[PDB]
RNA sequence: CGAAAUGGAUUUAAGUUCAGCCUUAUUUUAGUUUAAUAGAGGUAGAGCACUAAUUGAGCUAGGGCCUGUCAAAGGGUACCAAACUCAGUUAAACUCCGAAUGCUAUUAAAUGAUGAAUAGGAGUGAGACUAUGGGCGAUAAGGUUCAUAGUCGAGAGGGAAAC
RNA sequence: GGGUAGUUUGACUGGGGCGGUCGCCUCCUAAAGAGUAACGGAGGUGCGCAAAGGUUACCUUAGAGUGGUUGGAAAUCACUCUGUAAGUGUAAAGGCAUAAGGUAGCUUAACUGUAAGACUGACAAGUCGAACAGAUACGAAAGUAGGUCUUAGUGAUCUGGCGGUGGCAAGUGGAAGCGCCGUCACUUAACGAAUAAAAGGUACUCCGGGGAUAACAGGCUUAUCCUUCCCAAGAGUUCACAUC
RNA sequence: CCCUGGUGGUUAAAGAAAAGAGGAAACACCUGUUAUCAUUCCGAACACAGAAGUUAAGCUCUUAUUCGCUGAUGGUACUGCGAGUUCGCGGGAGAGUAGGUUAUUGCCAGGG
């Protein structure tokens, strides 16, 4: 009850502070946010001048058939990079979205980095 | 119990900075990485007298 | 009784008089308007043509206005812009 | 038995300097205050002493959200 | 008269164009003139220009 | 054509200086009053959610008294009473709320040298009273000291018996 | 060394003197922009901090109720309700859940040359400031950092001292000295500071003026004083009003 | 299009508590600490490795408005102005009351 509620509340507070520390995204340099469920891994690129998701990816996508490991998110970030290049976006701001930059997120971000995306 | 000290660039000896420091609290020899405008480069500055 | 402004404000330094090198300014536009080709713009001619007064004898040449006439110069100082323009027009410069 | 007190500081001239709807150019001071009586919205910045200033030319506007006032340049 | 009246009301009357007693001015009633007349109703006499 | 008796500073308080106010000349052209629309208050008022004051009931710790009480574990509560409930009140330095005016911006009318800048030249820097909002005093004083407006000051005439 | 000479010994002040006060900050007075007096009503202050700074990351009290060796109303711990009343070096106010609160790691931006555009303002001053260059600190990066959550912790000019730079160098060349940059020494607290250096009396007094300022009176007010009146609990054997 | 998850805008409680409904997908709880990480101790949170199980909880929907929040129309307080004076004109609360309120919406992904 209260313990789960306060865990949620802490996550929201962290999320909000992160958001206004990094600022909003613009069509030139939009914002990349992630979400880490118990099963999957989601990423979205958002332009807040419109509230529009320019691109997105997740491990649910059957064709990718990745898992939920460091290796899998490495490959997933590769796929995201190749999907964004054809829409000619190279600057992104990395909203860690209430998580700690470590492990899976670290591998995801570095994989976007080795392939010419400015985060 | 607070004295006005001067931070001196190590490699030139210029008294680049002046600051305040409390004696009788540390009586150490405060060192600070400060930017030495003669060299256009940061470096080490040590505590020293004023007069 | 308020401390006056010239006593609130501080001072700035000496005046360096008694050691100034003071001397007359003559401009290229003036030379163009007053002279012609071939003569020596110098102390004597500027004095008689009333571009300076014979109190000062260390003329400097500055570059206001434009000069078109080939002339010879015997002066004491010259600005870089003015001597560039004058060499370009094709005159000659001796520093005295 | 004289007065024990009688002591006052200099008035600091706080308050809103440009009214909502006025046209300002970059760098204008909008509010002088102690503390975020008014918070910062789009296109404004907060000084080290909570002054509100305009990052770009525009028209001042005040909004209210959950009872807090926000200043913006639109 | 304008003597002794409030400063604001003297300014309103001079904005209507009346400086003395016996001053005659024709005006077209819109919201502005209506507001000025309401401010200074006690010092004016309104007749209508057929 | 037309003041000031205000502000700032001062071995200043009967002085003097700067600003403001005034005038001459030139240049410049948008004061001010509304209406519409768009802004920020905590004043009046109101109120008890917050900080405090405080009334009658309900309820109840705790403390004291009494009662089969050794200073152990018990009970009666005429009381001293935290907290709590209902009802009703006080606050310039309390405000969960909040005007009317005033202030500020834009536009359209309306009013015609009222604005601003530069240059030249002063004077003033002792105010008083009335209609309001105040503080101090004794919700006393033609009292003292602030804010708005008017008058006298610098304004003749008519009226309030003279004033 | 007052034998003798030249001078100083403040102002505000509901007369003056005595007393008290003089810079700055917070709130009210202050009449809902700002500003706005008083010898109006309340406080703090002439610092502290090498972290109590900067950056990144991670977290939330106080109180009420309940259960626990000391441990009781209250120390520490668990949970429910409450949701900032807790806490922010230091006074108070305005603010602070994204916490500006708390903890931990790294670190010195507690930088240099600067600055578009402003607020406040008689002036002198004071404050905010995007952004640019160099050098960094932190973070993966975006970004932040030009001290302290903000608002008091302060002092002009002149003179003198120290360090750096090498402009000035009285015939020339050195040097002295000075300028420039960095910077120290004033309870100058009467704090926009008249001197580097300062106490009293004058009823023996004098001069220039003021009802702008006291004492005797005029005038205003009535605190105070005095003279009444309204209510009648009682006393008066009983009977509020014979009387008090 | 809809359910779910994630992400914006529109700020009126878009609030908590109690009761009922589900869980395909999705989400969450849940498994182990052994790999990098975190704790002023503690896989609680976080970190990493996975899918045995569930609606119990979180979440979604439906509920009496039980608590809160919001709020009429009038009237009053107060206020601008006035040769009408306890009035004439203009503006108009707070509180209380009749009520109302457990949002709405832009676009990304999975499939009904």
UniProtKB/Swiss-Prot annotation, chain A:
Instruction: Provide the family line.
Output: Belongs to the universal ribosomal protein uL18 family.
- This chain's protein is named Large ribosomal subunit protein uL18
**SUPFAM superfamilies attached to this UniProt entry:** Translational machinery components
Q: How does it assemble?
A: Part of the 50S ribosomal subunit; part of the 5S rRNA/L5/L18/L25 subcomplex. Contacts the 5S and 23S rRNAs.
Q: What is the lineage of its organism?
A: Bacteria, Pseudomonadati, Spirochaetota, Spirochaetia, Spirochaetales
Q: Which InterPro entries match?
A: Ribosomal_uL18_bac-type (IPR004389), Ribosomal_uL18_bac/euk (IPR005484)
Record's NCBIfam families? L18_bact
Task: Name one molecular function that GO assigns to this entry.
Answer: 5S rRNA binding
Concerning Pfam families, the annotation shows: Ribosomal_L18p (PF00861)
Q: Which key words are in the record?
A: Ribonucleoprotein, Ribosomal protein, RNA-binding, rRNA-binding
From Swiss-Prot, chain B:
- Family, per the entry? Belongs to the bacterial ribosomal protein bL33 family.
Q: Which GO terms describe its molecular function?
A: structural constituent of ribosome
Q: Name the Gene Ontology biological process terms.
A: translation
Q: Does the keyword Ribosomal protein apply?
A: yes
Q: What is this protein called?
A: Large ribosomal subunit protein bL33
Name one cellular component (GO) term.
Answer: cytoplasm
Keyword list (alphabetical) reads:
Ribonucleoprotein, Ribosomal protein
Q: Could you list the residue ranges that cross the membrane?
A: none
Swiss-Prot record, chain C:
Q: Keywords for this entry?
A: Ribonucleoprotein, Ribosomal protein, RNA-binding, rRNA-binding
In the record, what terms sit under GO molecular function?
rRNA binding; structural constituent of ribosome
Q: Which domain of life is it from?
A: Bacteria
GO BP annotations of the record are: translation
Example of a GO cellular component annotation carried by this entry: cytosolic large ribosomal subunit
Instruction: Say what the protein does.
Output: Binds to the 23S rRNA.
What does the annotation say about its assembly with partners?
Part of the 50S ribosomal subunit.
UniProt record similarity statement: Belongs to the universal ribosomal protein uL15 family.
Name of the molecule in the record: Large ribosomal subunit protein uL15
Q: State the organism of origin.
A: Borreliella burgdorferi (strain ATCC 35210 / DSM 4680 / CIP 102532 / B31) (Borrelia burgdorferi)
Recite the lineage of the species: Bacteria, Pseudomonadati, Spirochaetota, Spirochaetia, Spirochaetales
Q: Which gene encodes it?
A: rplO
Curated annotation (Swiss-Prot), chain D:
One example of the protein's molecular function in GO is:
structural constituent of ribosome
Q: Look up the domain of life of the source.
A: Bacteria
Any one cellular component term from GO for this entry? cytosolic large ribosomal subunit
Q: Which Gene3D superfamilies match?
A: 2.40.50.100
Task: Give the matching PROSITE patterns.
Answer: RIBOSOMAL_L27
Chain residue ranges for the region called Disordered: 1-13
Give the family this protein belongs to, as stated in its UniProt record: Belongs to the bacterial ribosomal protein bL27 family.
Q: What is this protein called?
A: Large ribosomal subunit protein bL27
Tell me the name of the encoding gene.
rpmA
């Amino acid at each position: 009850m209260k313990k789960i509620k306060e865990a949620e509340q802490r996550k929201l507070r962290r999320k909000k502070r992160i958001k206004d520390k990094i600022g909003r995204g613009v069509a030139s340099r939009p914002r990349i946010t992630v979400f880490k469920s118990n099963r999957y891994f989601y990423a979205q690129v958002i332009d807040d001048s419109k509230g529009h998701t320019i691109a997105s990816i997740s491990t649910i996508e059957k064709s990718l058939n990745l898992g939920k490991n460091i290796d899998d998110v490495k490959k997933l970030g590769e796929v995201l990079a190749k999907r964004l290049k054809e829409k000619n976006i190279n600057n992104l701001i990395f909203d860690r979205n209430g998580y700690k930059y470590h492990g899976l997120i670290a591998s995801f971000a570095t994989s976007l980095r080795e392939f010419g995306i400015n985060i | 119990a607070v004295e006005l000290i001067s931070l001196i660039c190590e490699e030139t000896g210029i008294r680049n900075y002046t600051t305040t420091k409390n004696r009788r609290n540390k009586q150490e020899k405060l060192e600070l990485m400060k930017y030495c405008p003669k060299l256009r480069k940061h470096t080490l500055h040590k505590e020293g007298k004023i007069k | 009784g308020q401390t006056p402004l010239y006593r609130r404000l501080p001072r700035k330094g000496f005046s360096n008089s008694d050691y100034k090198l003071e001397y007359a300014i003559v401009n290229l536009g003036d030379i163009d308007k007053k002279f012609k080709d071939g003569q020596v713009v110098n102390y004597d001619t500027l004095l008689e043509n009333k571009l300076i007064k014979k109190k000062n004898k260390k003329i400097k040449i500055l570059s206001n206005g434009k000069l078109t006439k080939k002339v010879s110069f015997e002066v004491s100082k010259i600005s870089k812009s003015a001597e560039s323009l004058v060499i370009k027009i094709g005159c000659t410069i001796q520093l005295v | 038995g004289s007065s024990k007190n009688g002591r006052d500081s200099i008035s600091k001239r706080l308050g809103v300097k440009r009214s909502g709807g006025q046209f300002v150019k970059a760098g204008e001071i909008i509010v002088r205050q102690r503390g975020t009586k008014f918070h910062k919205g789009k296109n404004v910045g907060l000084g080290r002493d909570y002054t509100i200033f305009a990052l770009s030319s525009g028209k001042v506007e005040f909004k209210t959200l959950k009872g807090r006032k926000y200043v913006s340049i639109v | 008269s304008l003597i002794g009246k409030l400063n604001k009301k003297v300014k309103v009357l001079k904005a209507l164009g009346l400086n003395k007693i016996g001053d005659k001015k024709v005006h077209f009633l819109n919201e502005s003139i209506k507001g000025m007349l309401n401010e200074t109703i006690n010092m004016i006499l309104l007749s209508e220009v057929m």
